[PDB]
Amino acid sequence: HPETLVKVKDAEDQLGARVGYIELDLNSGKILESFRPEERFPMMSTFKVLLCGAVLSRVDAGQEQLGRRIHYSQNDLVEYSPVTEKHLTDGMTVRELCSAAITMSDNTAANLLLTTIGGPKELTAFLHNMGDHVTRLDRWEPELNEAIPNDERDTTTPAAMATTLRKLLTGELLTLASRQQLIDWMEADKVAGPLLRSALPAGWFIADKSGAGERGSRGIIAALGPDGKPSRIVVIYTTGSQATMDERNRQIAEIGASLIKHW
Numbered sequence: 001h002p003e004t005l006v007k008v009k010d011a012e013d014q015l016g017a018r019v020g021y022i023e024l025d026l027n028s029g030k031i032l033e034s035f036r037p038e039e040r041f042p043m044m045s046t047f048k049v050l051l052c053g054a055v056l057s058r059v060d061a062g063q064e065q066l067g068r069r070i071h072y073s074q075n076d077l078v079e080y081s082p083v084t085e086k087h088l089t090d091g092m093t094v095r096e097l098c099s100a101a102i103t104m105s106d107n108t109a110a111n112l113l114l115t116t117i118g119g120p121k122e123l124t125a126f127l128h129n130m131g132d133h134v135t136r137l138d139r140w141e142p143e144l145n146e147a148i149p150n151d152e153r154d155t156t157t158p159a160a161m162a163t164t165l166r167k168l169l170t171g172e173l174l175t176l177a178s179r180q181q182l183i184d185w186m187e188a189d190k191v192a193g194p195l196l197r198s199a200l201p202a203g204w205f206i207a208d209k210s211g212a213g214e215r216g217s218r219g220i221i222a223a224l225g226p227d228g229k230p231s232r233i234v235v236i237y238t239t240g241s242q243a244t245m246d247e248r249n250r251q252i253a254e255i256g257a258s259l260i261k262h263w
């Protein structure tokens with residue numbers, strides 16, 4: 001609805017930065033509304049969902065096991081590893097790392113999983129392989145969050161990310177068991193409370209993954225809908241603002257409030 005674009009542009013004005021947006025019909029893949037849909041923005045942690053998608057793709061093909069245990073050490077720990085830093089002794093399984101990476105956005109977990117699939121180069125090849133010729137992961141945590149202006153490294157576009165998530169969650173790319181595991185990790189997301197979830201009406205479904213980076217970077221990707229089932233995909237990114245984390249969170253929440261109001 002056009003009223004939501006009013007809020008998105010209001011958001012660019014208040015944040016003094018670019019805001020990218022897109023609302024996608026989950027079933028048909030039709031773009032319902034957009035703002036800078038094909039402009040690049042850092043992915044920050046929203047990439048962790050694509051990372052686990054590639055991991056599940058491997059499991060389905062027998063190249064990986066969810067119960068497989070990964071051992072790591074202090075040397076591996078990078079900034080913001082609330083779950084992995086507590087398991088140095090016995091390690092964690094592939095399954096537990098994706099849980100950590102998606103629900104808590106644990107950075108070391110991401111790094112460990114990336115290592116299992118062959119690094120950024122491979123995640124990028126996986127994406128290209130599934131029709132996404134835009135999204136690219138080039139670095140590891142934490143450098144991929146640098147958000148250098150005009151830098152194409154570690155970026156995606158609102159349209160590219162929305163189309164790719166739709167495929168991950170409804171395509172024949174993953175088995176049904178794998179698709180549900182991914183959605184289950186996104187539905188349990190525990191660090192995105194002040195964003196879209198704060199505007200979600202009672203009874204609605206939402207599976208999401210947020211992101212934060214340098215230079216005011218903030219974003220979120222999500223599948224949501226009424227009566228406990230998702231029916232649309234929403235992707236929101238911004239970068240360049242000098243606004244506080246709280247102000248950035250609110251603008252996203254308000255964009256959310258509008259898209260829900262005009263559903």
Ligand SMILES: *[B]([O])([O])[C][N]C(=O)C1=C([C])ON=C1C1=C(Cl)[C]=[C][C]=[C]1
Nearest residue numbers: 044045079080105191210211212213
């Ligand atoms: B991802 O969520 O974009 C990566 N986030 C971080 O690496 C991070 C850091 C370095 O310090 N806090 C976070 C973080 C934020 Cl700002 C929000 C939610 C989870 C982690």
